[PDB]
Paper text:
The ganglioside-induced differentiation-associated protein 1 (GDAP1) is an integral MOM protein, proposed to have an auxiliary role in mitochondrial fission and fusion, possibly via redox-dependent interactions with cytoskeletal components. Structural data have shown a covalently bound dimer interface in GDAP1, and while dimerisation is a common feature in catalytic GSTs, the GDAP1 dimer is formed differently, with a unique interface having a central disulphide bridge between Cys88 from each subunit. We carried out structural and biophysical analyses on several CMT-linked GDAP1 protein variants and describe new crystal structures of the autosomal recessive R120Q and the autosomal dominant A247V and R282H GDAP1 variants.
The R120Q mutation is located close to the N-terminal end of the α3 helix. Due to the mutation, residue 120 loses contact with the α6-α7 loop tip at Cys240, whereby the hydrogen bond between the Arg120 side chain and the backbone carbonyl of Cys240 is lost. This is further linked to alterations in surrounding side chain conformations. Arg120 participates in a hydrogen bond network between helices α3 and α6. Arg120 is not conserved in GSTs at the sequence level; however, an Arg residue from the neighbouring helix in GST reaches the same position and makes similar interactions to the same carbonyl group in the ⍺6-⍺7 loop. In essence, all substitutions to Arg120 are unfavourable; this shows that the interactions made by Arg120 are important for folding and stability. This is in line with our experimental data for both R120Q and R120W, which indicate minor changes in structure, but destabilisation of the fold. Also R120Q had a slightly different conformation, most clearly seen in the distance distribution.
Numbering used by the authors:
A (entry chain A), B (entry chain A): 23 to 165, 197 to 302
Write the structure that this text describes.
């Protein structure tokens, strides 16, 4: 009876993780996309999301939670009905710290800096989905927050190190799993918060053109298979199916 | 036409400052007291507000702001119509840094620790408005977050140092102002955010019984006069008139 209310930007990275957790836990929520199709500067969503997509908020009766991570933790702590799926093993579980490891590993990536650099240095991307004139608009507003190419190759190399860990664990998952069985996700048989972080963060790289550089075409094949699997997951397609199409707003 | 929506706890200290700023700036807002009269443990509001009153949230079209200070700053930055009163002098004003000084000075006081200590050590209070059995309930839930008396006399002495600065500035204000004229507030003729912090924070001390110790009865007479003035201010009485009566909820 107590309502579950959420305010957010449909295309905000933070919002996407939260909205996917709600769908995974089969929770009834009253979502409110406060984002508008056209900005004051007459701009669409794919022209604005740098730091302008900031922090959502969740309202559950007497509780008010804001940031993405803090909202997800609240949902996991609160809705404990037997019918509600758990996205984290028990707190005292043998397998718990491994899940929280990959979760914090992915949640620490500077996604705003990756978005900041894509629009500013397209040459480092492949098949970017942002129009090229976005690089023309943001750079005309000029006359670590700056456009140091070395700084991007640095964190992009840092990203490859993180994905090397993921490819390894997925490889570990692949060998342990018999074929014709139920293929596991990142940490185990079940879909966890680490998977929520992975699905959403890999989908953002595909939007920014940082996908061909990191997986596919022979590189990190287990990561490619993982990403092609979440795309078909029904909870992921319903909540994030169109968040990369620049034709919907 | 764009609506102004707020979620909060009526008795939360943070919420009170925000709601007083809205009233001072004559802003039309859609306030939503999410606090309930009776807790899950069958408790009223005056039994719960330690850290359970946490952070409000403001929703203005595409913007989502959370903490109290950040909300107040947003309101000051946004609503600039000539008819909207300003609670801060211009950013490049000669008198600006003095206002921001007293504001940050008051906003840094550990109000949650003062509330925490009152219920835990009534002996250090005078005319506390919390029922005495609140000390009986919270201490029965046991079997810096702890109940070190020296730690409270420490920060209470720190509080007196802050109020000594306020009494001095109000004294300075008194001497400069001719009698029969318009009596000024803390920083000047106009009601500022520093006054919003002062009015709400002094009203909380009166609720916790830390008023007789700090002003009145001959002590800090300018502070006593200030507090008796805000009580009659129509914007203050409409928004905070009943927030100390334990009979309303």
């Amino acid at each position: 009876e107590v309502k579950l209310i959420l305010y957010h930007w449909t295309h905000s990275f933070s919002s996407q993780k939260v909205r996917l957790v709600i769908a995974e836990k089969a929770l009834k929520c009253e979502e409110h996309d406060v984002s508008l199709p056209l900005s004051e500067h007459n701009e669409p969503w794919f022209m604005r999301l740098n730091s302008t997509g900031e922090v959502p908020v969740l309202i559950h009766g007497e509780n008010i939670i804001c940031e993405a991570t803090q909202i997800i933790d609240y949902l996991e702590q609160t809705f404990l009905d037997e019918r509600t799926p758990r996205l984290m093993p028990d707190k005292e579980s043998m397998y718990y710290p491994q899940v929280q490891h990959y979760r914090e590993l992915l949640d620490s990536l500077p996604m705003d800096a990756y978005t900041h650099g894509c629009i500013l240095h397209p040459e480092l991307t492949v098949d970017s989905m942002i129009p090229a004139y976005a690089t023309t608009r943001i750079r005309s507003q000029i006359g670590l927050d700056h456009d140091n190419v070395k700084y991007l190759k640095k964190i992009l190399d840092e990203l490859e190190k993180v994905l090397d860990q993921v490819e390894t664990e997925l490889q570990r998952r692949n060998e342990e799993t018999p074929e014709e069985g139920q293929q596991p996700w990142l940490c185990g048989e079940s879909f966890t918060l680490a998977d929520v972080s992975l699905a959403v963060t890999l989908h953002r790289l595909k939007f920014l053109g940082f996908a061909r550089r990191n997986w596919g075409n022979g590189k990190r094949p287990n990561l490619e298979t993982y990403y092609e699997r979440v795309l078909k997951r029904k909870t992921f397609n319903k909540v994030l199916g169109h968040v990369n199409n620049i034709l919907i707003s």
